[PDB]
Design a protein around this ligand. Structure first.
Ligand SMILES: [Zn+2]
Lengths: 59, 121, 122, 46, 117, 48, 206
RNA sequence: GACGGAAGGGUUUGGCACCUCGAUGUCGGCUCAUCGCAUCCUAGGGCUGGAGCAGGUCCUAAGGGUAUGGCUGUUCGCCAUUUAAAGCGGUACGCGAGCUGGGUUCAGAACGUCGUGAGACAGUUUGGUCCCUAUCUGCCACAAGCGUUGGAUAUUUGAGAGGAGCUAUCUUUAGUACGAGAGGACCGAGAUGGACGAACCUCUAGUGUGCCAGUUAUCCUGCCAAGGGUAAGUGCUGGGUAGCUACGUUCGGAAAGGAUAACCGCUGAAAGCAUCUAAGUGGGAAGCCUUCCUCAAGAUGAGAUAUCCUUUAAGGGUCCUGGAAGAAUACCAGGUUGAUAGGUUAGAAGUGUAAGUAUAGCAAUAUAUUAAGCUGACUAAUACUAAUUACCCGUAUCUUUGGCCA
RNA sequence: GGACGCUGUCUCAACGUGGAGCUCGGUGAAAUUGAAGUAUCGGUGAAGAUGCCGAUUACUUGUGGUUAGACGGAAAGACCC
RNA sequence: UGAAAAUUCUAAGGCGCGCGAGAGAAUCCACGUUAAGGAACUCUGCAAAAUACGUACGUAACUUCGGGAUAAGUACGACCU
C-alpha cells in the first residue's frame, strides 16, 4: 500500500497534466451591455438576462 | 440504481428536508424574490406552485389545510388574499427560476426564484 | 415450502401428532418441498400407546402448506399450518382417516386415496 | 394417472417414427401419416 | 389512452361482480379434473382487493375443521360462475389481515352494516 | 488450410522473418494469394 | 428471416377459454418499410434493409436524407436493421404484422435493462461472508487467484463492474395472439428491455 | 494372478541444510476458483465361469456434474438420510495487505508426572489485540487523444474471443425378447422434475423514512375545535402505487453436418493362406471443428457498402432542459421549427369516509352530508414556466504504374 | 450439555435509512521511494524472474474498482542456534 | 408524566459541534423491515430478537428452614358515565 519505486518524472507529469485540467465555460455576449457572459446565466455586469432585470448590481 | 424519483433529498434527512422546504417557501412568499442554490430553489418551486394552485379557491377547509404547511399566519393570509387572485387564470407555471452562476468560495450553482406576476399591494 | 427441520402436523389417525422433516426427496441439492411431494420425517410427538413411536423415521406426503403456490387458473391456496400424512412402503397412506382439509394438488400428484379420505379438498 | 398421452401430431396424425439409412449414416427420424412431413424428433411435430 | 388497457377491455368478457371487503360471500366456480369439470363452492369473508387492471384479485378466508384456509381468486377469471353476498359487513381498514391473528369465534366474524329503515 | 487457405504459408514466412519493428515491416511487404491471380497488375511484377 | 421492429409496450395477462391464465408481453408495431437491398454480387451478401418509426424533419442529417432520395413518400426512419437472406419484398414495400400469422414461436432481440456499476454479489450470484460471528467480510469477492503460481490474476476473473445494457435475444417465445387492427403481438413470457424500448421480432429458428 | 524382476509419479513419512532469520505469518473453516487424468457418475467399446437383469475386468474419453446433517479445533475417520454418482491430486499440503482464532505458538490459573528446589513435559483444562487510504505489474469496467491515405454520417460482412455442453422419475415399445420360475430388457420416443443460467415484473412475495389512517406523551398555534414539531438516523402500529428484488413468472441445456479417439469393417498384400492397411475405401462418442448466444475492422491485415460535402462545407463537440442511460463519464431524447423537464388538467390507483354543518345520546360516541377528503414516484394532454436573437473544431498533399475517356 | 419460547445466525438474500466513498470549489498529509519508453507463457539461474533465452500477445494515455505479484510496507524475528 | 433526580417533552437560560456544495455507483461502517422455515449457521443460541411495569391469582424439588422465589405459570390496565 506504499509506492514501491519513485515514479519517473514522465509519469508524474503525465498524470498531473491530465488531471489538473479545467475546462473553459461557454460564453455568449449579453444582448444589453455587450459583455461576454456565461451562456445561460444572468449577466454579472448589467443584471439583464433575455432583456429582463433580475439583479441590482452594486459596488 | 436509483429508485424514489420525485425528490432531490436536498442532502438531508426527511424531517430536516421538510423543515427546509417549509422555511424557504415561507421566505419566498414573504419576499417575492429570493436567491439560493439551484437545487433548493427547484424543489421550492415544485412545492410553491402546488400551494398556490391549492389556494386558488378560498374556503375554511382549504385554509386549514394550507396551515398544515404554512405556519406563519401572516403569510398564509397573504397567500390566500394577495397572491393567488392574480394567478386565478394562469394554467400553471407561476414561478420562474433563473440561473446566476457559480458562487465564489464553494462553487455552488446560485439562482434566483421569483413570481411571474407580482401580487396585490 | 417445507424444508429440513420444519415441524408439521400429522393429519391422520396413525397416532403421531407432530413430525419433523429431515430430508427432501428427489433431487441432489433440492431444498423445498411443496404440496404433493414426499419427504422423510421423524416423529417428535405421538399419542400414547400407539402404533407409531416417537423417534421413528418414515416417509410422508405433504397435504397442507402455509405458503401459497400458483395453480394453472391463477388461484392460490394458502393454509394455516403445515401438515403431512405418513406413508407405508407402497407410497400409500398408512392411516385410515385424514383430519382437516387438504389441497387439491394431491389430485395431480396422484394421491387419489388421500384425497378421498380427506374431509374437504380446496 | 394423468392419462397416457396419445402420441399424436399437431396435424392429427400419429408420429410413427422409423430409421432412414444413408452412406454409413444411420438415422432415426419422425414421421406423420397424415401430412408426410419428415423431421427427426417428435418435439417438432406437436 | 393505452394499448394495454384496450387489449384488457377486449379480453374482459366477464364483468366484475359487486361486493366489498368484509362481506361474507359464497363463490361458485369451475374446476377441471383431467377432462371433467365440477362446480365448487367457497364461503368466507372477503379480506382484500388487489392489483391494477385485469390482474385484479380478491382474497377469501374461512375456517374449516379448525384449520384456517385462504384462497386468492382473479376477479375477471372465466371460471367464476357466481358470487353471492350472504352478509354485508362494516369495516374500517382496507385489508383485514388481523383476522389471521384473531382466534376462536372472533376469528371469523365481522360486525355487519345495518341499513337504515 | 480449409478455413484460411493462405494461413500456413503466411505463418511460416512470419516465423522465418526476423523479429522486431523491421521484421514486422518486412511482413507488411508481403502479399499472399490463394489462387493463381493477383490484383497488383499495376506494378508489372517481375516473375520468378 | 422474417423480422419486424416493434416497441415493448408492457406486460399483462390473458385468460384462455377454459380458465388457464397466460402471462403475455405486448409489442406494438409501427409501420415497417423496406428501405433498400443488399446483394451478394455488389455488397457480398443478400439482405433486406428494414426501417421503422420516423424522425423529426429538423433532425435528419443530409446523408440520412439522401438515403431515401429514390423512395417515394417514405420519410427517414429512426430504427434501421437488416434481415439476412430474405426475399419476396423490394424497396418501397411495407411489412404487415400478419407475417407471423402462421408462426408458433418467435425470437425477440432487445437491449436489456441497465443496472449501473454493480457489485459481484448481484452480478455473479457470489455468496458473501457471514453477517455475524465476528465476520468483517460481507459482500466482497473473497480470494481471487492462487498464491505464487501464477503470480497474476487470470483474464476473465469475475469482479465488480457495470451490469447490463447488452443486447440479448430470447428464444422460442410462444405466440399467443395477433391483432392486426391495433398492430399488436402478444407473446408468452418476458422480453428484454424497458418499457418503450424497441425490440426486433424474428421467426423462431426451431 | 503365489515367490521374484524392471520403472514412473515427487502427494505421505524422511534424507540433505542449497534460497530465506534489518521477519517467506504455521493447522482447519468460510468465500472464490483453476489445472492435470492415474475417470466417482453420465458417453462410446472389447471380453467374461456375460441367460436376461445386475455386475466383474480392460481400452478410449476431463464437456458438465460430483450432497446435506450428528461427533470432533480437527485434515482424516465414523454414523444417519440421500443422489445417476457423493472421484483422486497439483496450485506456498490453492486462497489471512479477503474473512474466521477453534487449535497450534507468549505472559494467568489448575490438574497429572518428573526434579530437593527454582522448573520442565508434541500430558490435560480454561482465559488470552489478527495492523496498513494500492505506486507499478495483473485483472474487472467506462472514457480522452489518435490512426485506418478526401473528410464525415449510417447499415454490416467477419478474423478472433467469451458464455453455453447436467441429470433423474414415470408412462408406452414390453411383462414382449430372454428365462424352469422368479425376475426382467437392448434400441428408439413422449410427458413431468431437480440442480444451474439469463431475461422480466403479468401473477405470488418483500421493501416502500413519498403518502394516508389509528394512537401514547409533551409543547406550540390566544383558546374550544381543528392541526403541527419531538420521542437518534420514521414516536409506536395498521396498509400502500412506482422502482427494485426472488420466495415469482417466462425461456434456454437441442437437432443436424464435417473431420475423428477407443472399437468394428469392406476389398487385399508383403508372407500363394490369413489379415481393418501396406495402395485405396469406410462406420464410429457427453470429445474436436461449424452450428446456438454475446463482443468484435486499434484485425495497423485497420474490411465492404449507401448517402452528403468540395476552403471550413458536410458533420461533430461544448452549453442547457432530461431519460429507457448513468461514479465524473459516454450513449440516447429534446432545445421555440419543441410536449424534453417542471407546473397544470385528467386517468389508472393508495388511504377507506375529511373539514364544516346537522340529528341522536348526560357524555364517550354514532349517523347523514360522503366510493368523501387527501395523496396521485406512473400514464395521456397542455408552451403556463424553463432549453436564447450561440461559441469553438472540421475536406483528393506528393511520386510511380495500369485501365477508361480525350 | 440439554429443553421451551423467540428470532435474517443460517437455506438466501433483497429493500430502505444515516455517516464515508463518487464529482466540483477551498485548505491539504503520511509511511515508502537506486532509478522505470515494468507484457505474458515455457525454460534456465544463489535453486519461486518485470529486466536472461525461445516463443506469444499488445494503438497512446487516464479514471472508478479489486489485491494475484513486486518473496509489499511497518518491527537489525520474539521461535532455533 | 411517574413512586422517584428514571423515560420523553418543554420554560428560563445557553447553543445549532470552525470546510462546504452537488449527485446518491459499487463498496465500508452504524441501523430499520420481511413471505415460508425456526439454530438446519457456527468452536459456542456469539450477536440479535424477545421478555420487562403496576395490581391480583398461583408457586416445586431441595434445604443449614434463612431460602429457593419476581420460581414456573395465568388475568387485567384506554375513554365516558
Ligand atoms: Zn449584461
Amino acid at each position: 500500500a506504499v509506492p514501491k519505486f519513485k515514479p519517473s518524472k514522465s509519469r508524474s507529469r503525465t498524470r498531473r497534466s491530465i488531471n489538473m485540467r479545467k475546462k473553459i465555460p461557454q460564453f455568449q455576449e449579453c444582448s444589453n451591455c455587450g459583455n461576454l457572459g456565461v451562456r445561460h446565466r444572468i449577466c454579472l455586469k448589467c443584471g439583464y438576462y433575455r432583456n429582463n432585470q433580475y439583479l441590482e448590481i452594486g459596488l | 440504481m436509483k429508485t424514489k424519483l420525485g425528490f432531490n433529498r436536498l442532502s438531508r434527512k426527511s424531517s430536516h428536508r421538510r423543515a427546509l422546504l417549509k422555511n424557504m417557501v415561507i421566505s419566498f412568499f414573504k419576499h417575492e424574490k429570493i436567491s439560493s442554490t439551484k437545487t433548493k430553489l427547484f424543489e421550492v418551486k415544485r412545492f410553491a406552485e402546488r400551494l398556490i394552485t391549492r389556494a386558488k379557491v378560498d374556503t375554511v377547509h382549504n385554509r386549514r389545510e394550507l396551515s398544515k404547511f404554512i405556519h406563519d399566519k401572516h403569510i398564509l393570509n397573504k397567500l390566500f388574499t394577495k397572491i393567488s387572485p392574480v394567478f386565478r387564470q394562469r394554467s400553471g407555471g407561476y414561478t420562474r427560476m433563473i440561473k446566476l452562476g457559480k458562487r465564489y468560495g464553494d462553487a455552488a450553482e446560485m439562482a434566483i426564484l421569483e413570481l411571474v406576476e407580482k401580487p396585490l399591494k | 415450502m417445507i424444508q429440513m427441520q420444519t415441524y408439521l402436523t400429522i393429519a391422520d389417525n396413525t397416532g403421531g401428532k407432530v413430525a419433523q422433516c429431515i430430508k427432501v426427496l428427489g433431487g441432489s441439492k433440492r431444498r423445498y418441498a411443496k404440496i404433493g411431494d414426499i419427504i422423510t420425517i421423524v416423529v417428535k410427538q405421538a399419542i400414547p400407546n400407539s402404533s407409531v413411536k416417537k423417534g421413528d423415521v418414515y416417509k410422508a406426503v405433504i397435504v397442507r402448506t402455509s405458503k401459497e403456490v400458483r395453480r394453472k387458473n391463477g388461484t392460490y391456496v394458502r393454509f394455516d399450518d403445515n401438515a403431512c400424512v405418513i406413508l407405508d412402503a407402497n407410497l400409500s397412506p398408512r392411516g385410515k382417516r385424514v383430519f382437516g382439509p387438504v389441497a387439491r394438488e394431491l389430485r395431480d400428484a396422484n394421491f387419489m386415496k388421500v384425497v378421498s379420505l380427506a374431509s374437504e379438498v380446496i | 394417472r394423468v392419462g397416457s398421452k396419445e402420441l399424436i401430431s399437431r396435424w392429427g396424425g400419429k408420429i410413427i417414427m422409423k430409421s432412414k439409412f444413408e452412406n454409413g449414416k444411420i438415422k432415426h427420424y419422425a414421421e406423420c401419416q397424415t401430412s408426410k412431413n419428415t423431421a427427426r424428433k417428435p418435439r417438432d411435430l406437436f | 389512452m393505452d394499448l394495454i388497457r384496450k387489449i384488457e377491455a377486449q379480453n374482459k368478457k366477464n364483468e366484475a361482480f359487486v361486493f366489498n371487503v368484509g362481506d361474507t360471500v359464497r363463490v361458485v366456480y369451475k374446476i377441471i379434473e383431467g377432462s371433467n369439470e365440477r362446480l365448487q363452492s367457497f364461503e368466507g369473508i372477503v379480506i382484500s382487493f388487489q392489483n391494477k387492471g385485469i390482474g385484479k384479485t380478491f382474497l377469501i378466508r374461512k375456517i374449516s375443521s379448525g384449520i384456517g384456509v385462504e384462497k386468492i381468486f382473479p376477479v375477471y377469471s372465466p371460471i367464476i360462475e357466481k358470487v353471492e353476498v350472504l352478509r354485508r359487513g362494516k369495516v374500517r381498514r382496507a385489508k383485514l389481515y388481523y383476522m389471521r391473528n384473531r382466534i376462536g369465534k372472533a376469528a371469523m366474524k365481522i360486525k355487519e352494516r345495518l341499513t337504515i329503515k | 488450410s480449409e478455413r484460411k487457405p493462405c494461413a500456413p504459408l503466411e505463418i511460416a514466412i512470419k516465423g522465418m522473418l526476423p523479429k522486431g519493428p523491421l521484421g514486422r515491416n518486412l511482413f507488411r511487404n508481403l502479399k499472399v494469394f490463394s489462387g493463381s491471380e493477383h490484383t497488383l497488375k499495376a506494378q508489372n511484377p517481375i516473375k520468378l | 428471416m422474417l423480422g419486424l421492429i416493434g416497441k415493448k409496450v408492457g406486460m399483462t395477462q390473458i385468460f384462455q377459454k377454459n380458465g388457464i391464465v397466460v402471462p403475455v408481453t405486448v409489442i406494438e408495431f409501427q409501420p415497417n418499410y423496406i428501405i433498400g437491398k443488399k446483394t451478394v454480387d455488389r455488397d457480398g451478401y443478400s439482405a433486406l434493409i428494414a426501417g421503422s418509426v420516423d424522425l423529426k424533419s429538423s433532425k435528419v442529417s443530409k446523408p440520412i436524407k439522401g438515403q431515401y432520395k429514390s423512395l417515394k413518400d417514405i420519410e427517414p426512419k429512426r430504427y434501421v436493421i437488416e434481415l439476412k437472406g430474405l426475399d419476396g419484398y423490394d424497396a418501397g414495400d411495407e411489412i404487415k404484422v400478419d407475417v407471423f400469422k402462421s408462426v408458433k414461436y418467435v425470437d425477440v432481440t432487445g437491449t436489456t435493462k441497465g443496472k449501473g456499476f454493480q457489485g459481484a454479489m448481484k452480478r455473479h450470484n457470489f455468496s458473501g461472508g457471514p453477517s455475524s460471528h465476528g465476520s468483517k467480510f460481507h459482500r466482497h469477492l473473497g480470494g481471487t487467484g492462487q498464491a505464487t503460481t501464477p503470480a497474476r490474476t487470470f483474464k476473465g476473473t469475475k469482479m465488480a463492474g457495470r451490469m447490463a445494457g447488452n443486447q440479448q435475444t430470447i428464444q422460442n417465445l410462444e405466440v399467443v395472439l395477433i391483432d392486426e387492427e391495433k398492430r399488436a403481438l402478444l407473446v408468452k413470457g418476458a422480453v428484454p428491455g424497458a418499457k418503450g424500448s424497441f425490440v426486433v421480432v424474428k421467426k423462431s429458428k426451431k
